[PDB]
Scaffold this active site. Structure first.
Site, PDB file in Angstrom:
ATOM      1  N   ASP A  72       0.832  -1.201   0.000  1.00 39.65           N
ATOM      2  CA  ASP A  72       0.000   0.000   0.000  1.00 39.65           C
ATOM      3  C   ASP A  72       0.872   1.258   0.000  1.00 39.65           C
ATOM      4  O   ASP A  72       0.617   2.224  -0.739  1.00 39.65           O
ATOM      5  CB  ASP A  72      -0.843   0.012   1.276  1.00 39.65           C
ATOM      6  CG  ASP A  72      -1.938  -1.048   1.289  1.00 39.65           C
ATOM      7  OD1 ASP A  72      -2.620  -1.262   0.253  1.00 39.65           O
ATOM      8  OD2 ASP A  72      -2.137  -1.648   2.367  1.00 39.65           O
ATOM      9  N   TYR A 332     -12.703  -2.672  -3.175  1.00 42.38           N
ATOM     10  CA  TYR A 332     -13.327  -1.459  -2.604  1.00 42.38           C
ATOM     11  C   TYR A 332     -14.570  -0.969  -3.356  1.00 42.38           C
ATOM     12  O   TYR A 332     -14.696  -1.190  -4.543  1.00 42.38           O
ATOM     13  CB  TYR A 332     -12.288  -0.328  -2.545  1.00 42.38           C
ATOM     14  CG  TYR A 332     -11.320  -0.403  -1.386  1.00 42.38           C
ATOM     15  CD1 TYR A 332     -11.318  -1.494  -0.508  1.00 42.38           C
ATOM     16  CD2 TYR A 332     -10.379   0.592  -1.185  1.00 42.38           C
ATOM     17  CE1 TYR A 332     -10.418  -1.569   0.558  1.00 42.38           C
ATOM     18  CE2 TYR A 332      -9.478   0.520  -0.119  1.00 42.38           C
ATOM     19  CZ  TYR A 332      -9.498  -0.574   0.747  1.00 42.38           C
ATOM     20  OH  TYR A 332      -8.619  -0.671   1.821  1.00 42.38           O
TER      21      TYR A 332
END
Ligand SMILES: *[C@@H]1O[C@H](CO)[C@@H](O[C@@H]2O[C@H](CO)[C@@H](O[C@@H]3O[C@H](CO[C@H]4O[C@H](CO[C@H]5O[C@H](CO)[C@@H](O)[C@H](O)[C@@H]5O)[C@@H](O)[C@H](O[C@H]5O[C@H](CO)[C@@H](O)[C@H](O)[C@@H]5O)[C@@H]4O)[C@@H](O)[C@H](O)[C@@H]3O)[C@H](O)[C@H]2NC(C)=O)[C@H](O)[C@H]1NC(C)=O
Ligand SMILES: *[C@@H]1O[C@H](CO)[C@@H](O[C@@H]2O[C@H](CO)[C@@H](O[C@@H]3O[C@H](CO[C@H]4O[C@H](CO[C@H]5O[C@H](CO)[C@@H](O)[C@H](O)[C@@H]5O)[C@@H](O)[C@H](O[C@H]5O[C@H](CO)[C@@H](O)[C@H](O)[C@@H]5O)[C@@H]4O)[C@@H](O)[C@H](O)[C@@H]3O)[C@H](O)[C@H]2NC(C)=O)[C@H](O)[C@H]1NC(C)=O
Ligand SMILES: *[C@@H]1O[C@H](CO)[C@@H](O[C@@H]2O[C@H](CO)[C@@H](O[C@@H]3O[C@H](CO[C@H]4O[C@H](CO[C@H]5O[C@H](CO)[C@@H](O)[C@H](O)[C@@H]5O)[C@@H](O)[C@H](O[C@H]5O[C@H](CO)[C@@H](O)[C@H](O)[C@@H]5O)[C@@H]4O)[C@@H](O)[C@H](O)[C@@H]3O)[C@H](O)[C@H]2NC(C)=O)[C@H](O)[C@H]1NC(C)=O
Ligand SMILES: *[C@@H]1O[C@H](CO)[C@@H](O[C@@H]2O[C@H](CO)[C@@H](O[C@@H]3O[C@H](CO[C@H]4O[C@H](CO[C@H]5O[C@H](CO)[C@@H](O)[C@H](O)[C@@H]5O)[C@@H](O)[C@H](O[C@H]5O[C@H](CO)[C@@H](O)[C@H](O)[C@@H]5O)[C@@H]4O)[C@@H](O)[C@H](O)[C@@H]3O)[C@H](O)[C@H]2NC(C)=O)[C@H](O)[C@H]1NC(C)=O
Ligand SMILES: [Ca+2]
Ligand SMILES: [Ca+2]
Ligand SMILES: [Ca+2]
Ligand SMILES: [Ca+2]
Lengths: 389, 389, 389, 389
Positions: A72, A332
């Site tokens: 990330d 997501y």
């Protein structure tokens, strides 16, 4: 121009498949293209245009920088954008700022771009208003200061934004910032159920109120639910009471025993969730999305409920349709709103990640669905990518 | 700005070769480009710009997604566009919506984009006005709801559009929709010869009347011919009476025995056909195109007739010129109009498909011809592509 | 906006190297680019922008369509353009019309684009004003109707253009057309020395007069020189009298024996030549270019003379500088003018062809030089391309 | 529009990492992109946009023109630009002019582009205002006439620019030019310490004064420091007195013995240095950058001092933060200013060169840092490139 305000929503009573942006359709070894390796995509619309944002790893497919493309946070990560409808490639995209966490919105006059950067223990929220970098905000819990990965929300010129700071496995008490022409003019400290809130997907219920459906990564599969009054600049959080648990992983619907605030079990980990408002003259629709699998990031269903209080109403959300099949990836999701001439059109985006593990490339497609006409939601979405090409 | 209206046509009395868009000129294995794999191209013009639209398979040449690129309907198919004059590549193109059937038009203020999506038995017409998705329309015969694959037509703000629903081999009774700022404000049910009408190519005969030359895929080689009055919002269909049968396949000209409405033979299958109006002060030219071969999709000739009633006038259309030679492919054709400063310029587009069967890539070029000057049409068009490169 | 007029020229007294557009710098097999294969480049400027035009073979390097890329005329050839400063690639370029001979200009309001198409014995000049195709002109000698391959010239809205028709080896009597908002409103038939005139490079000497330096492909190495009065719409041609013969091939300067009009020897073949005006308050500069070699298309020198009559003045042009060395290719040249805020800046372009014969790729670079400051012209131009890459 | 003036600076008291442009992230053999091979990048901002400029070798990676890509001067070198945020590729970039030394600025109305070209002994400064080439300036010492490789500075329409001419190893006495709508209207001859000044990085201290931190390539490691009064058009140069020597190579801080003007040792060679002003109501911040290594072009630190006279104040600059680690390359740096709505945002750019020697490709990334919020500078920058890919 003039400041944006939420209007009433355009007519309709179902969502339909609108648009797929699948940049890795053109990422073949035998092709000639350069799709950017991204994750955490989201969309935000202004009075004239919609922008499709993402966080890139600063690498393309095909290419030689696949390694680390499953993490990330790193010093190359960036917030990038194309006009929605354009494929996000090396050449099409514009790079806004270094960032491994992101938001953006348009106030009616100009774009605000938000990006969090820096070391894990002392990370930094950075604000760009148009071309100008204009402010920052410091980590207050020294554990991965973070923001929404979806659009912020502006009204009469004040743009509102969730941030959070804390352990992904423990306490992450979020706050809200009020940003105006790119400078932070107020800090809001929510009250109520504050243990763990991150990745809030927010929108306007009205000219007085902003709401958000957030993620608890540690404690519960019920989404934390923010009500923020923009007239007094005060905020309160409680868990969503519905039996239709919207996080993943989760247990079977309705199996969390207790009153509205109980946690209880298989609530570690989580996922950012779609959420968007349908504002009518004497009624409000709340639209949500969640994964088809209870445990894996596979599929994505759309649900709705009209009126009530999400804090105290335990009733099921109404299944509207399968947006992504169980056989397809569903990571997501986010909400956003397109400005038609006299009304707002609610929409939900879906990140569809191409995941083969950390020893190949890691990126995503984006599927969009929006309120349009009447009846039932009709078709699902596939990425169409073969990761070995 | 202000609403568009049809004007009188610019001076001229022949069509000439204007423009070839052959994106697969750059699709070589030894090249560095990414032309989009398309079919059903068409063009539509607004007061300032012309857009070149198509339905893409979401795949490029060179590349690895050639399989399924010969089918019409799938969940990846999309309506895409470039400014006319630009090559439709991965990067140049903008993606408007998921769709395996398409139309678009400009009303003087804004673009309307139409796309039909969904399952064969319950497909869905979707309308985008600018950025906003604004309406839909449901399948009424539950058998591949469909639209024009060419420009819709707007006047004083009302945009008119054919749709159809039904078996490709049996009944497909079309209707017309009247769309205004992207919402359907009226449904029109034609009367008369309604058995099978699809892929209507339409334009304005006047400020009162829209006409269209359509395709019967089952029953006849005569094109069905729509007259739609826009003052009363009523429509009537009859077959074209000319001996110059415009569909493919077809029998030899004039060999269908009977009055104007007879079918009769070798009229199964079909093709979308070019059709455009030349509006003069006291006279009207109707321009048409059709394939050089009577049976195969090879070549394309241009024909014209001035005045008369196409429903009842059995006389030949006047051959104007060979636009594509018999040795070159000639698949769909359409009409459109470019706005010069004080008059409209009629044009005909030609889809030239690169067909090697379903075990390679399947896409198309686009050839344009337009009214310009006087005399005879002078040159033909080749794609110049070698499909093995 | 308002109609363009020639103004007085900006201050200066030498030309300097301005800009190289060498698209084949990026045409390598080991690269990832797609430069368009062109020839006959030229530049034309409007009140806000300059466009770089060319005739493409509809093929890129690297690629598989090298064959036929050394011919002039075919059914794929097209007029294309980029904003000057952009590399002319598959994606950057816009395609204006089919053409194997070209011109274009801006009248102050809009662009006019000219392209000649069709068969050798019945070719066709086509005019596009903005998006609209608006007129044509028919071959009058049925032998390769042709135009300038450089900018046309507009004043008060009338744009003036040379055309020619006839044998490349015999008579080619040119005419001039007067074009207004894209339609031909007058034909001009020159008088005087009319045997062979083609590829005229033209510009304004004043508000009354246009001049041009043209090519005789058959009879002489002296450039034919047009004076066209735009107040009476009349034109007269005579040969340039200077000993500095500007065509290639040519004999040694001053060796053509006779009065101003003699031909005489080594005057077969030819080349398009640069020519541009420096208009001052009480004086006029004429700027010209020609090849360094007397026989081959190698090198390019810049020359100037102020005032006099080119028809009758036998004196040498003044060598200003070597723009391209003898070791580098120097094919076509043209003049053009950039609009500064209150004055016009004269410039000369140079086509630098990459020629390895007909069994490889055939394209060109473009070198620009313009009036700027004082002193002498200082540096020469190389393409930098290795054709085997 | 209206002429630009320096305003007071936006609120803040630290710089943070803003933006990395690393085009060679996509330069792999196994990729499909074409990043331009550049060096000497810099940024300049106008009222609406920021442009990222560089000098290209007219070659891409991957490709076949790597040879000579480590030299500075050749006949292919060019000034190129993209909108800041876009990757500088073959297609994205616009080519402004031939140049192996560069500057550019926006006066509020239009862009001025400066490029030095020509032979080493008689090189030539060339000025483009918008599209128009408008002036030049001749070499006055006949030894590599040169300019800043960073933004020029305009006020009320007069744009100010350092140039220099002379031996890189001996005397290079710079001058300043005052340029207005692209023509040189004044020459300024500095007084004081004039032996060697080149690559000045300049900005406005106020509406009266421009300052610059320059490079002495021969004599000293103290940066020469220009104060130019724009009301009287006069300039004076002295060396910076600080013990924090900003050139590379350099000796240990404070080890140059003597008064403010002493040279003394390890001051051969040098580097262009970042420098930017923070203008407050009753105080001025001067921001500087320099390499982490004392000898090699590795790393880059940011320093600041508020008020005082740099000519006479021997005190250390205050270390603010490490912008590039010692393990990463750090070559040229520059200052620039972004226009927010009512104030100016100071920034520093950093050229991060990919250097493997002259037997491979030679290009650069660009790292940007800008005043934003309060506290300390938090993160450093890596290019992320593996040169063997
Ligand atoms: C956040 O607050 C917003 C401001 O309060 C609110 O905006 C209003 O939204 C409603 C939607 O229900 C709109 O009302 C609709 O009006 C249309 C016809 O529009 C015309 O009439 C209105 C005023 O009529 C009403 O209000 C007046 C008092 O203002 C009363 O006396 C009366 O009883 C009526 O109920 C007029 O203001 C409009 O002018 C706006 O719109 C036009 C065209 O769109 C613009 O040109 C103009 O600049 C201006 O923006 C208009 O002429 C009617 O058909 C519907 O039935 C409905 O009543 C309002 O237009 C709108 N008000 C404004 C000032 O924009 C947002 O909805 C709210 N958002 C949320 C999420 O709650
Ligand atoms: C759909 O309906 C449209 C509206 O009815 C129709 O538009 C008209 O098209 C005709 C083409 O035949 C044009 O008429 C031509 O006029 C030009 C000179 O133009 C000027 O004169 C007209 C009016 O003259 C005529 O009409 C009046 C009544 O209105 C009569 O008294 C008289 O007998 C005349 O016959 C004037 O309106 C024009 O103004 C328009 O145009 C100018 C410049 O173009 C614009 O600036 C302005 O905004 C306005 O649009 C103009 O000043 C003449 O040379 C020709 O011989 C011819 O008579 C009309 O201009 C045009 N009308 C309008 C209102 O635009 C469409 O043609 C029709 N479409 C189809 C397919 O049928
Ligand atoms: C094609 O014809 C064009 C029109 O005839 C011609 O344009 C003229 O070019 C000359 C260049 O020599 C310019 O004259 C210069 O003027 C400037 C100062 O400019 C201001 O003054 C002029 C008028 O002054 C002269 O003319 C009047 C009669 O008109 C006489 O009484 C007097 O004796 C003077 O000699 C004025 O018209 C200008 O206005 C123009 O320019 C301004 C700013 O640029 C614009 O805002 C405005 O819209 C208008 O365009 C201006 O205020 C002076 O410093 C010089 O010494 C020189 O005298 C003219 O400006 C220009 N005329 C026009 C109407 O544009 C073209 O040059 C010609 N082209 C060729 C190739 O021959
Ligand atoms: C180069 O010179 C510039 C011109 O001198 C200078 O610009 C000035 O910068 C200062 C920053 O300190 C600004 O002053 C600030 O004003 C704001 C409120 O702004 C409004 O008030 C000012 C005038 O107030 C002062 O000056 C007057 C005399 O002019 C005195 O009587 C009084 O005592 C005050 O001290 C007014 O001019 C402004 O108008 C400008 O700005 C508005 C909005 O931004 C524009 O719409 C308008 O077109 C105009 O540009 C404004 O209404 C206050 O809050 C602060 O405390 C501060 O006093 C000035 O605005 C600004 N002046 C101008 C004419 O722009 C540059 O700073 C200087 N640069 C450098 C590097 O030194
Ligand atoms: Ca959880
Ligand atoms: Ca049929
Ligand atoms: Ca000759
Ligand atoms: Ca030094």
């Amino acid at each position: 121009p003039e400041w944006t305000y939420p209007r009433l929503s355009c007519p309709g009573s179902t969502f339909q498949k609108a648009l797929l942006i699948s940049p890795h359709r053109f990422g073949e070894t035998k092709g000639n293209s350069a799709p950017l390796i991204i994750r955490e995509p989201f969309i935000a619309c202004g009075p004239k245009e919609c922008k499709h944002f993402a966080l890139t790893h600063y690498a393309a497919q095909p290419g030689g920088y696949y390694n680390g493309t499953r993490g990330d946070r790193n010093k190359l990560r960036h917030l990038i954008s194309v006009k929605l409808g354009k494929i996000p490639t090396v050449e099409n995209s514009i790079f806004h700022m270094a960032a491994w966490s992101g938001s953006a919105c348009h106030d009616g006059k100009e774009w605000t771009y938000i990006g969090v950067d820096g070391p894990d223990n002392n990370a930094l929220l950075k604000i760009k208003y148009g071309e100008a970098y204009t402010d920052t905000y410091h980590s207050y819990a020294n554990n991965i200061l973070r923001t929404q990965e979806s659009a912020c929300n502006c009204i009469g010129g004040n743009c509102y934004l969730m941030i959070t700071d804390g352990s992904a496995s423990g306490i992450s008490e979020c706050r809200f910032l009020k940003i105006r022409e790119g400078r932070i003019i107020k800090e809001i400290f929510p009250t109520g159920r504050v243990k763990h809130t991150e990745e809030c997907t927010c929108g306007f219920a009205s000219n007085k109120t902003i709401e958000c459906a957030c993620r608890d990564n540690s404690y519960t599969a019920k989404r934390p639910f923010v009500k923020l009054n923009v007239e007094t600049d005060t905020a309160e959080i409680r868990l969503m009471c519905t039996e239709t648990y919207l996080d993943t992983p989760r247990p079977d619907d309705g199996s969390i025993t207790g009153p509205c605030e109980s946690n209880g079990d298989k609530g570690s980990g989580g996922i950012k969730g779609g959420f968007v408002h349908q504002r009518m003259a004497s009624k409000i629709g709340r639209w949500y999305s969640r994964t088809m699998s209870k445990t894996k990031r596979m599929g994505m269903g759309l649900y709705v409920k009209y009126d009530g209080d999400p804090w105290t109403d335990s009733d099921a959300l109404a299944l509207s349709g399968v947006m992504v099949s169980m056989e397809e990836p569903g990571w997501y999701s986010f909400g956003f709103e397109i400005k038609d001439k006299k009304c707002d059109v609610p929409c939900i985006g879906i990140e569809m990640v191409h995941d083969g593990g950390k020893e190949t490339w890691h990126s995503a497609a984006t599927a969009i669905y929006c309120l349009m006409g009447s009846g039932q939601l009709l078709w699902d979405t596939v990425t169409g990518v073969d990761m070995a090409l």
